[PDB]
Design a protein around this ligand. Structure first.
Ligand code: SF4
Ligand code: NI
Ligand code: NI
Lengths: 313, 708, 252
């Protein structure tokens, strides 16, 4: 037989997040994920851990047992996570600014983000709520306060793409996440809008959507496949940015993960089901072409790191 | 002294003042003394922008005078005038830099002097998002304090950041204008050279937000001209230095407005004596648009109030239908014939109603003017009217053109709804949704029985007839640009729709004019332009540019397409189509199936099996999906002979299309009643029966060349 | 019908059509020019439908002047050479050019009647004006009788500025004229107060008094005079110098 050696004319761009020796690079691959036989994968996929500013009341009991003594303080929580598990990056989700739930002024969340970012050396990803109107002001304040650390701002959706673009990349030299929803054409549109604003492909990453396994997962898989094939096979310049997928945002809120053993006695250990859901979702999206994943349970982080190490090496 | 000589004289005076103050700095501080601006990373921004050099000591400040000298070439050509304006800007910066060298704090409050980099980053985000519509650079002196206060507070109330130079700072204080960075009223200084402090804001905006390295002067000037919405209002007598500084503002693309008689340059240097119109003149000159945040109406306006039908019990007023005559029209007119935010009502209002549900004619006339507005965009906006009225609770609008059908509830009458609020809502939504192509909007509500009919006859019906004529007479030959749509790629990844005047979007809702309007109004959207280049086969419908665009958009899945043929490199289908055309070789023709037709066809497969075989963005020769309007097209199966191949069709589809199908067949080569020769499910649904009927009916498809 | 029936007598073996065609834009009547100028009029200032924007660009010095290039070909001059060289020199010197007749057709063949020509040949002021108004640097105003339009245009400008037509920085050029119509045109253009350059010497060199009248004394009568110059580059230089002289007289 003849070895299959189809070549690609495209290459995913590289985006650097963080400062110092902990700074991580995303992108650079010229082939499909883990296709070390086809060519070179520019950077290894990065795994990050998720923390909240407020106490995680809705998380499962094992996770609240893991962070029983640090979950009150975001700074202590971030320092504990960094000292114990040493992730590639930390995602600080500002859920206290969610208008539907408890509502907070952008100044308080910006102060919390600054306190967290001035206590850790690992790259920090600041994620807002789902509200675009709140997100614009929140990210303006956060980027003003957390200046000089090259943080990543998530969910710069089209409705506020200018504001998060202006307060982020342009003003305070941060990175941004252009977010679309299970569509390759919408990802192209948001990338083109960011490029026309004056923001290069080296200044933002993409979020083509994320879902838990079993809940619209095939749409995410197909979108990842399509954007990867277009960026590499077609040399589509507007899709050549790295992709970040927040897995624990959706995979940890499903019935299979969040049902206690007393709620479903036949299913078994709640912690095992949570870790299994996280690992399955992250593994699938990593295989489909994501560059960074955000995980909640440290066991999931360890399993995914070993998975990446086994596949790449 | 002409304009060029005035600017050259001003630049020389600016150079003379720069040399004198630099000499003082050398004599008092020495050439080793540090030169800097408070809290900036760009050194002296204008010199850094123009040359890329950072100036740190007094000796280099003295060496920066050569930049001013090299920028003053006294030749009466436009480029030299702009360079001389930049010479004044560099000289003004050197003067301001020497001020900080000579005196530790050269500006006393209210003047702020230099604007630090953190402030620029603070106001940079509102500049990008449009929260700051523009920068009003006001310098000089107004005839009185109240005139200055009125203009300044007019800019402030519109969200613009206004900067003040000269005696207008004192006049505004006498006029009690609240000055502050959060109040967007920044006094820079009483000297003309203080205007450089807002110039460096635009310069550093290019450096910080545009990412342009120092020394790339042309890129920086291009950036400030396109990205920074700044303009100059020069009040009071203007010296040569002021005019030369204005040439610097013009060099950055900022138009200069003044109340003085000057050698006007269109779009760049304008005289406006009327202080009551200076703000509006400047906004037009700088293309600044202010977003009306709220619609000044008492009744609630929201999208959630669409489709809430109010019954006879709730209803107060009723327009159109069989009760009376009502019409709506959106027409493009020259800017002189439209007046911005002019809402007028002709005739009685709904307040004169007897409180019983009453009938009265309603004529709605919306004149829109703009630079990018054309006649083909008139229907599109008009359709949105249907939604704009429906988002108001208490009123409902259905119908189009002279078939307008509107109901207004009694609760709207209680809350305070009148006919002027129709115009207010229409104007607000026209300027919001269609701000790209609509600059000025005038709404007129007519209630008189005579005036409504007179305006409908004069304006409405001629435009309806011309729109119908344009829709009828457009063919692929006249145009030189088709349009590609990829909206249905969310479920058909390889599907690309090519829309021509004769080939509609196969969903049935996207036309050539609709695609053009979408491309104009929504760039980077579903609809993009496809030039008609590299024609290969006009009978078949092959263009090299069309193949290139299809290959690009489909991400390489489909490489070559044919617009007019069903068997050779056909177009793909997504799944929104209502009709499917399939080939029947025994009849030497093609059969047609519709979505509502659930029974079988001569071909065998039903619509569902045909839909599964045809849709999904796969090129399947011999089958295609399309709408009801493409059937009677001149280009329908032009590559295989024409629509004479149509041999079978459901009776409902045939009855719907018969008129235009007969017209096109009469033009083709056939007797007008071509519908009767086409078989249907009533006569026969079977191979041999259909073939027998066709051959006994003299169908033209049996006399053509073999279809395959 | 006679022409169409003659197609049957075509000998296709004798046919040779060079594949050389050029896109051109024309139709610039005074009304069309005014309509184009309306774009650069601020609505809050006005007025509309006047030559005022053109008068403004001329007075401010963004445009140095306006020149009419008219006339025929003549075997005495390399065909179309003088037309093209004169037009390119004028537009390079920020002189807006209006063309009529065979000169206009030479400009059309060469490719000057294009919007793109503004960025390829025009100087900075004229390039800016062309971009702002969306016009070519060379405006085709029609046939030889349509030179009257040029007069009309100039007259309007003069009437807007309250001066005679001899006070404006305007000129006419006939680089390659041959016809008696061209002689009459140049004579009435000079008599109207517009200096005229002739690229072909008229048969007057034998009469010293006539040469002196046409090139020197005419300026005392009507404020304009003939210039005889067979070198197009020198003609462009002389036109620019004369326009600058009239600008300095007018104070602009
Ligand atoms: S079928 Fe209609 S909506 Fe779908 S891609 Fe074609 S034109 Fe767009
Ligand atoms: Ni479709
Ligand atoms: Ni479809």
């Amino acid at each position: 037989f003849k070895k299959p050696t189809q070549k690609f004319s495209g290459k995913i761009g590289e985006v650097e997040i963080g400062t110092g020796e902990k700074a991580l690079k995303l992108g650079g691959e010229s082939v499909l994920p883990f296709y070390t036989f086809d060519g070179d994968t520019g950077n290894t996929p990065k795994v990050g851990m998720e923390i909240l500013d407020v106490y995680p009341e809705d998380w499962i009991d094992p996770l609240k047992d893991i962070y029983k003594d640090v979950a009150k303080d975001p700074v202590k929580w971030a320092q504990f996570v960094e000292e114990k598990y040493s992730p590639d990056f930390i995602c600080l989700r500002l859920i206290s600014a969610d208008p539907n739930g408890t509502d907070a002024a952008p100044e308080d969340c910006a102060k919390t983000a600054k306190a967290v970012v001035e206590a850790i050396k690992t790259p920090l990803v600041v994620a807002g709520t789902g509200n675009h109107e709140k997100d614009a002001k929140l990210f303006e304040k956060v980027a003003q306060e957390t200046e000089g650390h090259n943080i990543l701002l998530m969910s710069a959706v089209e409705d506020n793409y200018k504001s998060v673009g202006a307060a982020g990349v342009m003003a305070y030299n941060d990175k941004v996440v252009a977010e679309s929803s299970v569509d390759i054409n919408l990802a192209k549109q948001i990338n083109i809008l960011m490029n026309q604003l004056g923001i290069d492909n080296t200044k933002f990453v993409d979020n083509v959507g994320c879902a838990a396994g079993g809940y619209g997962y095939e749409y995410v898989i197909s979108t990842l496949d399509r954007v990867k094939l277009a960026a590499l096979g077609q040399d589509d310049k507007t899709l050549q940015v790295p992709i970040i997928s927040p897995v624990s945002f959706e995979a940890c809120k499903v019935k299979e993960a969040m049902d206690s053993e007393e709620d479903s006695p036949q299913w078994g250990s709640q912690e095992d089901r949570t870790v299994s859901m996280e690992v399955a979702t992250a593994s699938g999206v990593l295989a489909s072409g994501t560059d960074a994943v955000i995980l909640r349970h440290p066991k999931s982080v360890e399993v995914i790191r070993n998975f990446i190490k086994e596949l790449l090496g | 002294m002409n304009l060029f000589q005035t600017v050259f004289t001003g630049s020389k005076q600016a150079l003379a003042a720069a040399e004198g103050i630099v000499k003082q700095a050398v004599d008092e501080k020495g050439r080793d003394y540090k030169v800097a601006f408070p809290d900036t990373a760009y050194s002296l921004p204008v010199i850094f922008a123009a040359t890329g050099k950072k100036i740190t000591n007094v000796g280099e400040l003295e060496g920066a005078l050569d930049i001013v000298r090299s920028l003053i070439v006294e030749e009466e050509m436009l480029d030299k005038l702009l360079n001389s304006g930049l010479a004044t800007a560099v000289a003004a910066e050197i003067i301001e830099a020497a001020k900080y060298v000579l005196s530790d704090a050269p500006y006393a409050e209210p003047c702020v002097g230099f604007i630090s980099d953190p402030i620029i980053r603070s106001l940079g985000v509102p500049l990008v998002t449009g929260d700051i519509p523009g920068v009003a650079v006001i310098l000089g002196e107004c005839p009185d304090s109240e005139t200055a206060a009125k203009i300044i507070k007019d800019y402030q109330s519109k969200g613009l950041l206004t900067c003040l130079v000269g005696k207008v700072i004192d006049q505004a204080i006498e006029g009690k204008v609240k000055m502050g960075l959060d109040l967007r009223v920044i006094p820079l200084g009483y000297d003309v050279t203080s205007v450089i402090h807002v110039v460096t804001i635009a310069i550093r905006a290019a450096l910080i937000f545009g990412g342009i390295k120092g020394g790339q002067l042309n890129d920086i000037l291009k950036y400030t001209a396109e990205r920074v919405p700044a303009f100059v209002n020069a009040f009071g007598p203007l010296s040569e230095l002021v005019v030369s500084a204005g040439a610097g503002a013009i060099a950055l693309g900022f138009p200069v407005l003044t109340d003085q008689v000057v050698p006007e340059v269109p779009t760049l240097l304008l005289t406006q004596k009327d202080y009551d119109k200076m703000v509006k003149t400047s906004l037009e000159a700088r293309n600044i648009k202010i977003k009306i945040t709220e619609i000044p109406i008492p009744v609630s306006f929201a999208a959630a109030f669409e489709g809430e039908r109010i019954r006879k019990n709730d209803m107060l007023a009723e327009f159109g239908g069989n009760k009376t005559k009502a019409w709506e029209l959106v027409m493009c007119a020259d800017q002189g014939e439209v007046e911005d935010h002019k809402i007028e009502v002709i005739g009685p209002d709904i307040d004169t109603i007897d409180k019983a549900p009453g009938r009265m004619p309603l004529g709605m006339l919306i004149k829109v003017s703009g630079t990018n507005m054309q006649k083909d965009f008139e229907p599109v906006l008009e359709r949105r009217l249907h939604y704009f009225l429906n988002y108001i609770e208490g009123v409902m609008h259905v119908g189009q053109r002279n078939l307008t059908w509107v109901r207004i509830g009694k609760e709207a009458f209680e809350k305070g709804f009148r006919l002027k609020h129709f115009g207010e809502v229409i104007y607000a939504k026209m300027l919001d949704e269609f701000g790209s192509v609509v600059d000025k909007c005038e709404v007129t509500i007519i209630t008189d029985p005579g005036k409504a009919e007179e305006l409908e006859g004069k304006y409405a019906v001629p435009r309806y007839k011309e729109r119908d004529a344009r829709l009828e007479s457009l063919v692929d030959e006249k145009v030189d640009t088709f349009y590609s749509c990829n909206l249905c790629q969310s479920f058909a990844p390889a599907h690309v729709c090519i829309v021509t005047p004769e080939r509609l979007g196969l969903c049935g809702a996207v036309s050539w004019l609709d695609a053009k309007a979408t491309l104009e109004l929504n760039p980077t959207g579903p609809c993009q332009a496809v030039p008609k280049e590299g024609v290969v086969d006009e009978n078949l419908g092959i263009w090299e540019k069309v193949n290139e665009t299809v290959s690009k958009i489909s991400q390489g899945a489909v490489t070559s397409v044919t617009l007019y043929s069903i068997l050779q490199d056909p177009m793909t289908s997504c799944g929104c189509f209502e009709c499917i055309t399939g080939i029947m070789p025994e009849a030497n023709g093609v059969v047609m199936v519709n979505r509502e037709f659930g029974a079988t066809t001569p071909l065998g497969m039903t619509f569902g099996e045909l839909a599964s075989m045809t849709g999904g963005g796969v090129q399947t020769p011999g089958f295609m999906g399309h709408g009801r309007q493409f059937i009677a097209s001149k280009k329908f199966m032009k590559g295989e002979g024409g629509l004479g191949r149509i041999v079978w069709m459901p009776k409902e589809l045939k009855d719907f299309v018969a008129e235009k199908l007969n017209k096109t067949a009469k033009e083709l080569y056939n007797i007008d009643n071509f519908a009767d020769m086409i078989c249907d499910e009533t006569i026969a649904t079977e191979s041999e029966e259909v073939v027998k009927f066709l051959e006994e009916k003299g169908h033209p498809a049996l006399k053509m060349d073999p279809i395959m | 019908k006679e022409a169409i029936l003659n197609f049957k007598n075509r000998d296709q073996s004798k046919v040779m059509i060079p594949e050389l065609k050029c896109k051109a834009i024309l139709g610039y009547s005074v009304e069309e020019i005014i309509n184009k100028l309306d774009k650069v009029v601020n609505t809050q200032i006005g007025p509309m439908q006047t030559v005022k924007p053109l008068a403004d660009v001329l007075v401010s010095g963004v445009l140095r002047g306006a020149a009419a290039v008219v006339g025929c070909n003549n075997p005495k001059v390399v065909q179309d050479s003088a037309h093209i060289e004169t037009i390119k020199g004028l537009i390079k010197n920020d002189v807006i050019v209006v063309v009529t007749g065979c000169a206009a057709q030479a400009a059309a063949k060469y490719g000057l009647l294009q919007k793109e020509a503004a960025e390829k040949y025009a100087g900075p002021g004229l390039a800016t004006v062309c971009k702002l108004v969306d016009i070519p640097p060379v405006l085709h105003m029609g046939s030889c009788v349509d030179i009257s339009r040029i007069l009309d245009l100039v007259g309007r400008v003069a009437n807007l500025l309250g001066v005679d037509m001899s006070d404006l920085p305007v000129a006419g050029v006939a680089p390659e004229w041959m016809s008696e119509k061209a002689v009459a045109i140049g004579t009435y253009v000079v008599t109207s107060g517009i200096d005229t350059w002739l690229g072909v010497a008229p048969p007057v060199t034998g009469g010293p008094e006539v040469v002196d009248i046409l090139t020197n004394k005419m300026e005392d009568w009507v404020g304009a005079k003939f210039f005889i110059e067979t070198d197009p580059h020198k003609a462009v230089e002389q036109i620019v110098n004369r326009m600058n002289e009239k600008r300095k007289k007018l104070g602009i």
